[PDB]
RNA sequence: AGCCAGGAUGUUGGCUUAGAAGCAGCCAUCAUUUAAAGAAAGCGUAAUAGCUCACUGGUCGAGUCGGCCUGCGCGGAAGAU
């Protein structure tokens, strides 16, 4: 109805798949077509990995008492987040994998342990094993 | 790169093919025993949709894809033709275990993997060609 | 073009423009559409 | 009795009529269906045939699409166009009358590089301006 | 408002048609992943192809859109010493 009371249900949404998930992966999303995305999001389906694409200002606001507040410096230029709704730090390794590899959009931040990670410095999550 | 949907058995006729890929280079012959080298499987008489892919030096590969749903779905539904006009007249009604079937029939085309959620766009498709479920 | 009394747009594409106390339409697609008040 | 065409599918009974015994000839029956025959006539839905031909034009593939429009603008129907390699052949039916001269056209509208060939097909009934055109030119 | 991109998938919805493939027409118009997606508001093709739009994310960083009433103006407005 309202688009300020359509914010209240986005917000309030987001945030509470944020309290359930595990290692958020924000990433660019720019310069991609429509298909191409649909072959990470069917394989965020099959890891539990929630995607979705919301407001900078919006997701300031939504991890605003999680973990997840130390990513205010990356909401800036188009946002692809990921959550990891089960088998923690999975979403990660996929995500480098594809930027690298056909696109031109960069791992902005990744975000587990409640702490922000630079791009160059992400490995960690992939060396760290699905267990 | 060009797309067409030609007979299960049959990559002889010109129009169809010739003009479309024949300025791309596609040796036509290649193309139409190799189409139908792999699409032998398919039942007869089921058109199927192929995408061809051709590159700068005239060479070409191609994935053959699942017939188009309304031609699919008058056959299990066992009509001919099709509906005149949606909401005055039904001419059959589908089954739903032929839905589903349908659903993992193209599997591979369908963006949602929930199955379920691939029947109701089968049966959403369906709805438009005056066809009713049980 | 057409000089007549009433001006107006008759597409989309059609602007009405005021260059010297003149209602003028100038048309980007149809050039059959220029028009001025006069 | 409509112009002068020929008449064409026409069946006739003769379910009753009048004979006087010293004065029926021929020619007087003759003059009797005559009179009854241009009645009829009248009085039934009478229309003009006019004849169509099968039309195959063989064009270059540029310029296709404006043969089919200049066929569209001489009052014909198509039953399909093949494209082969050397050039794209249109098939149609075209009423003669409107297939008048149609080599010039074709020319300029292909470079003068198509050409095309008429077979007669069948007759089929004219539309009501075509027939209104050929009644009064033939009736003055 | 401008600019950077997307503008999806079943698919060329079903009929009619030589072709009707978002875009001749009739009958619909609803599922899909969605940030968002008209079985397209336009251009275009013989049909395709192709170009935009609606709809969205970013950038930007402060007002902006549509009507109603009303004051004063503008065009309409060419003649003979
Ligand atoms: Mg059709
Ligand atoms: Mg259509
Ligand atoms: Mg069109
Ligand atoms: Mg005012
Ligand atoms: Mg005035
Ligand atoms: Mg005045
Ligand atoms: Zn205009």
Redesign the interface.
């Known amino acids: 109805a309202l688009n300020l009371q359509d914010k209240q249900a986005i917000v309030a949404e987001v945030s509470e798949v944020a309290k359930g998930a595990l290692s958020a992966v924000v990433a660019d999303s720019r310069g991609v077509t429509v298909?191409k995305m649909?072959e990470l999001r069917?394989a965020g389906?099959?890891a539990g990995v929630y995607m979705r694409v919301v407001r900078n200002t919006l997701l300031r606001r939504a991890v605003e008492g999680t973990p997840f507040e130390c990513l205010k410096d990356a909401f800036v230029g188009p946002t692809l987040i990921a959550y990891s709704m089960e088998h923690p730090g999975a979403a990660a390794r996929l995500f480098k994998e594809f930027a690298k590899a056909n696109a031109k959009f960069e791992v902005k931040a990744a975000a587990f342990e409640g702490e922000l990670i630079p791009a160059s410095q992400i490995d960690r999550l992939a060396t760290l094993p699905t267990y | 790169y060009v797309k067409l949907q030609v007979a299960a058995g049959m990559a002889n006729p010109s129009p169809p093919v010739g003009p479309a890929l024949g300025q791309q280079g596609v040796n036509i012959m290649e193309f139409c025993k190799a189409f139908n080298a792999k699409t032998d499987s398919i039942e007869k008489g089921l058109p199927i949709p192929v995408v061809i892919t051709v590159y700068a030096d005239r060479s070409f590969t191609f994935v053959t894809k699942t017939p188009p749903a309304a031609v699919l779905l008058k056959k299990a539904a066992g009509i001919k033709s099709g509906s005149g006009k949606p909401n005055k007249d039904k001419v059959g009604k589908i089954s739903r275990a032929q839905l589903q079937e349908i659903a993992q029939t193209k599997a591979a085309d369908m963006?949602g993997?929930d199955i379920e959620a691939m029947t109701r766009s089968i049966e959403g498709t369906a709805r438009s060609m005056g066809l009713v479920v049980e | 073009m057409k000089v007549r009394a009433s001006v107006k747009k008759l597409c989309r594409n059609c602007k009405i423009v005021k260059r010297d106390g003149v209602i003028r339409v100038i048309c980007s697609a149809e050039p059959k559409h220029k028009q001025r008040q006069g | 009795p409509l112009a002068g065409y020929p008449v064409v599918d026409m069946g006739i009974r003769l379910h009753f009529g009048s004979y006087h015994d010293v004065d029926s000839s021929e020619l007087a029956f003759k003059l009797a269906a005559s009179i009854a025959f241009k009645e009829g006539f009248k009085k039934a839905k009478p229309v003009l045939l006019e004849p169509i031909m099968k039309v195959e034009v063989e064009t270059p593939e540029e310029n296709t699409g404006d043969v089919i429009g200049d066929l569209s603008r001489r009052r014909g129907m198509l039953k399909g166009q093949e494209s082969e390699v050397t050039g794209v052949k249109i098939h149609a039916e075209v009423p003669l009358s409107e297939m008048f001269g149609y080599a010039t056209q074709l020319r300029s509208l292909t470079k003068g590089r198509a050409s095309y060939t008429m077979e007669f097909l069948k007759y089929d009934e004219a539309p009501s301006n075509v027939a209104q055109a050929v009644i009064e030119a033939r009736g003055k």
């Open positions: 298909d649909t069917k389906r099959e | 963006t993997a």
